């Protein structure tokens, strides 16, 4: 009940007392481990499965207690008067409203608790933008544009989150239908192959269905589809000057520019749900900067993504008949030296998987000492290439789900009543 | 209760009904996932925690039923007369003895159930050597030498297991003290650095402590330390002609021979415990062939193993000041093309991590169709380099512990009464 996690590269041993405070569930049982299921039911939020006035006050009290404990005023009168104040509003309104300071704490700790995120050494350096006064899709488009500008910061990227009004009933819901604020379109072809990004082919067509004007090329930035207060979503195009992009070159191979690759600088995921004190925020886009491999390994090289190992190995002229020539591996390392180099030579913030995973080990030390633990998902923390030459491969990690938290939710076009 | 596992590269969906038959536990709970703890208490067997005459007959019946079900004679008279026969012996002797055919089935299914093993497409092609008539360490050394010869098969390797007498009391225990039959010595130095293999430095010194004559070099094959029926273990040196080794060269870089590397062909793990029908076999060395990465990635490049990324990147002349030049990754791929090439050009059976992981996906299809599932540990199945350009990265796997099974046990020098 005071568990032990070893590192097998250092023999360092840490002790996790934080998992005791865990409330949510994991999907594993004593007789089956689901640690490799991608989207377990526990990590998802249906708009039906909200909460009711009863369910709310434990979640509120629980949250308020950890907040006042953290500003060094647990159980005090200022604390207890807030419990009463929320209590009264939860009886009255059946819901309740967070202070600015409570929204900022709750947001930063949903990132801090994000067990699948390797960048968390930065969790308290998060800029929270309060968009809870937003009422229209145009309002949403305005707040999201300012988010992009700020977080992008001319390439010196800054973490940020923009938080639209919380769910209440379930129908009147704020939702960004894009999975990420900046994303490349995906168009299928006559012969069936895919230009652009296969991941977003479904979404690309929903935008065309709502009347988008697709420049049917490769790296076409999708428009935003913003649903405000349950009303049908509306298309807006980010001003291109606001979309920072990196052309991908190589510090040795001159033909790498010929490949004609580029990516956007800002990873800003827009489809997930923030949960603070039992309140659900269905529109909460959040952003930081990339780890190289997310582009260079997954985006570019997943078979069902850009799938470029083909042409890169070609231009390297590689033994491609035999599978055991490791021609796939060989071209994957070059593609990742190129994304790093390109981003750095353009002064756009990026981290390599070695730097980031050492920071996570550092951050894990801090959380275990100053917090009693650090929830971590090994399956997601280990980078998708050169796994075992990074320190996180040899680090045993306890996974458990604390709150405040980020969660998945269905795509709104499967649930929305039009 | 009839769970679903998706593949996210193919959208293939499989259904696991086999996990229902699961008996052992996993270490995870509804509130915490231990899927990345290396040696969980559930995967270990203490020599105290055997079983007693009561505990035995369920385990026997359970095992016997799955055996007779599998030779297409469930619940029959031949089956029921065996249940009675074992029952009687479990009352009489408080233990019992397996048929040859029951030992062979049980062994093959302990491999079949090995959730952390990616080579299992081969599980029914396993040669079982019955060493249950062995009484002395010299007998053990004889059986192990024949195992090496057979399994090595002049380079065309064959899977095999040799099974020494089962535990009974707990003191009179057959144990191979080596962690693997063939392993390279590990000697510390004056300045502290390690020649040989750092992993086995502890074990190397126990052999010297028992009087081994160390040729204090690099790739010195350790002697066997064989404990028979609880008596103190005894040193034997495998005839060198029986130890097949591969010198490691590169199909491009001529300086790769200068590195002066080699590995043994036969991976044969000797320290684990086979568990069949509630009987414990503490000495059961088992072997197949290597996947490249176990040598080329872990053995050669782990910081606390051979740790050669240093010199390889040097001879490639690599940007080594900056961490983000990926010089570590770049040299890891070359080292793995070299292990593959060397093993193949010597006609020694080896598999690359791409070939092996596709086979595992094939094997997983077969087990789900003809067995209702396949227990799998993603943390261990995904290879330690180029993780996400192999199909197992995108395959959700259910982990659960069936029986017959292989298990860890303490090192005998911490438990043995001398
Ligand atoms: C500041 C630099 C950051 C870096 C380098 C980083 C890194 C990563 C990486 C590599 C992943 C894996 C993504 C994938 O595999 O597709 C991830 C996931 C994630 N990140 Fe971070 N991140 C950063 C900032 C943030 C911020 C600011 C937030 C929230 C406000 C956040 C929350 C998350 C969440 C919720 C996940 C997925 C967890 C899940 O599926 O449950 N990250 N991150
Ligand atoms: C025939 C070719 C085989 C291949 C390519 C193979 C491959 C592998 C690999 C790559 C690992 C990971 C080892 C590590 O990461 O250090 C592993 C583990 C393992 N293998 Fe296999 N293996 C083979 C045969 C066998 C046989 C014949 C047995 C048993 C009779 C076996 C049982 C196991 C077990 C028990 C583990 C560890 C599971 C645990 O820790 O619970 N394998 N195997
Ligand atoms: C702030 C941030 C920075 C970064 N550097 N990376 C990030 C990656 C994700 C992320 C989480 C889950 C994802 O996918 C879930 C599969 C679709 C269901 C994806 C996209 N693959 C991204 C994320 F949220 C935030 C990230
Ligand atoms: C038959 C076979 C073939 C192969 N190709 N590979 C194999 C690897 C292991 C294995 C399992 C666990 C291990 O280590 C556990 C850590 C020490 C506690 C190691 C050595 N690292 C090897 C094994 F059993 C059998 C293997
Ligand atoms: C099946 C498996 O759960 C799936 O491929 C996961 C594995 N680990 C991952 N890890 C990260 N960081 N991102 C991912 O998309 C995935 N995908
Ligand atoms: C901490 C973590 O459990 C440990 O590094 C594991 C990870 N996965 C592994 N996978 C394999 N195949 N072999 C290993 O030794 C390990 N080590
Ligand atoms: Zn689990």
Curated annotation (Swiss-Prot), chains A, B:
Q: For binding L-arginine, which residues are annotated in this chain's numbering?
A: 180, 289-290, 294
The free-text domain note is: The PDZ domain participates in protein-protein interaction, and is responsible for targeting nNos to synaptic membranes. Mediates interaction with VAC14.
Q: Which gene encodes it?
A: Nos1
Q: Which organism is it from?
A: Rattus norvegicus
List the subcellular locations: Cell membrane, Sarcolemma; Cell projection, Dendritic spine
> In UniProt terms, what is the effect of altering residue 290 to S?
30% decrease of nitric-oxide synthase activity
The job of this chain, per UniProt, is described as:
Produces nitric oxide (NO) which is a messenger molecule with diverse functions throughout the body. In the brain and peripheral nervous system, NO displays many properties of a neurotransmitter. Inhibitory transmitter for non-adrenergic and non-cholinergic nerves in the colorectum. Probably has nitrosylase activity and mediates cysteine S-nitrosylation of cytoplasmic target proteins such SRR. Inhibitory transmitter for non-adrenergic and non-cholinergic nerves in the colorectum.
Where do the annotations place heme b binding?
Answer: 117, 408
Give the residues the record marks as binding (6R)-L-erythro-5,6,7,8-tetrahydrobiopterin: 36, 379-380, 393
Which terms does the record give in the GO molecular function aspect?
ATPase binding; cadmium ion binding; calcium-dependent protein binding; calmodulin binding; enzyme binding; flavin adenine dinucleotide binding; FMN binding; heme binding
Keywords of the record, alphabetical order, are:
Calmodulin-binding, Cell membrane, Cell projection, FAD, Flavoprotein, FMN, Heme, Iron, Membrane, Metal-binding, NADP, Oxidoreductase, Phosphoprotein, Synapse, Ubl conjugation
Q: How does it assemble?
A: Homodimer. Interacts with DLG4 (via N-terminal tandem pair of PDZ domains); the interaction possibly being prevented by the association between NOS1 and CAPON. Forms a ternary complex with CAPON and RASD1. Forms a ternary complex with CAPON and SYN1. Interacts with ZDHHC23. Interacts with NOSIP; which may impair its synaptic location. Interacts with HTR4. Interacts with SLC6A4. Interacts with VAC14.
Q: Origin, by domain of life?
A: Eukaryota
Q: What is this protein called?
A: Nitric oxide synthase 1
> Mind naming one GO cellular-component term on file for this protein?
sarcolemma
């Amino acid at each position: 009940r005071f568990l032990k996690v070893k590192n097998w590269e250092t023999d360092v041993v840490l002790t996790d007392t934080l998992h005791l405070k865990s409330t949510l569930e994991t999907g594993c049982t004593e007789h089956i481990c689901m640690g490799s299921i991608m989207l377990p039911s526990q990590h998802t939020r249906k708009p039906e499965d909200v909460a009711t006035k009863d369910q709310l006050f434990p979640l509120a009290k629980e949250f308020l207690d950890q907040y006042y404990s953290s500003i060094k005023r647990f159980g005090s009168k200022a604390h207890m008067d807030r419990l009463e104040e929320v209590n009264k509003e939860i009886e009255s309104t059946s819901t309740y409203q967070l202070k600015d300071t409570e929204l900022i704490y709750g947001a930063k700790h949903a990132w801090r608790n994000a067990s699948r995120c390797v960048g968390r050494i930065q969790w308290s350096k998060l800029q929270v933008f309060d968009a809870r006064d937003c009422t229209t899709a145009h309002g949403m488009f305005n707040y999201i544009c300012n988010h992009v500008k700020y977080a992008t910061n001319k390439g010196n990227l800054r973490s940020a989150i923009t938080i639209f009004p919380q769910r209440t009933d379930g129908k009147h819901d704020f939702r960004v239908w894009n999975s990420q604020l900046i994303r490349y379109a995906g168009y299928k072809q006559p012969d069936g192959s895919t230009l652009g990004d296969p991941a977003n082919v479904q979404f690309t067509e929903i935008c065309i269905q709502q009347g988008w004007k697709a420049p049917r090329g490769r790296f076409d930035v999708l428009p935003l589809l913003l649903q405000a207060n349950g009303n049908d979503p509306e298309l807006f195009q980010i001003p291109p000057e606001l979309v920072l992009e990196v052309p991908i070159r190589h510090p040795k191979f001159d033909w790498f520019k010929d490949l004609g690759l580029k990516w956007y600088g800002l990873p800003a995921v827009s489809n997930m749900l923030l949960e603070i004190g039992g309140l659900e925020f269905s529109a909460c886009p959040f952003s930081g900067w990339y780890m190289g491999t997310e582009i260079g390994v997954r985006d570019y090289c997943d078979n069902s993504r850009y799938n470029i190992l083909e042409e890169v190995a070609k231009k390297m002229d590689l033994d491609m008949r035999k599978t055991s020539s490791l021609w796939k591996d060989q071209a994957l390392v070059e593609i990742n030296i190129a994304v790093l180099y390109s981003f750095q030579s353009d002064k756009v913030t990026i981290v390599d998987h070695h730097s980031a995973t050492e920071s996570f080990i550092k951050h894990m030390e801090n959380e275990y000492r100053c917090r009693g633990g650090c929830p971590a998902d090994w399956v997601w923390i280990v980078p998708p290439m050169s796994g075992s030459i990074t320190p996180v491969f040899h680090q045993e990690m306890l996974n458990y789900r604390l709150t405040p938290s980020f969660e998945y939710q269905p795509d709104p076009w499967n649930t929305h009543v039009w």
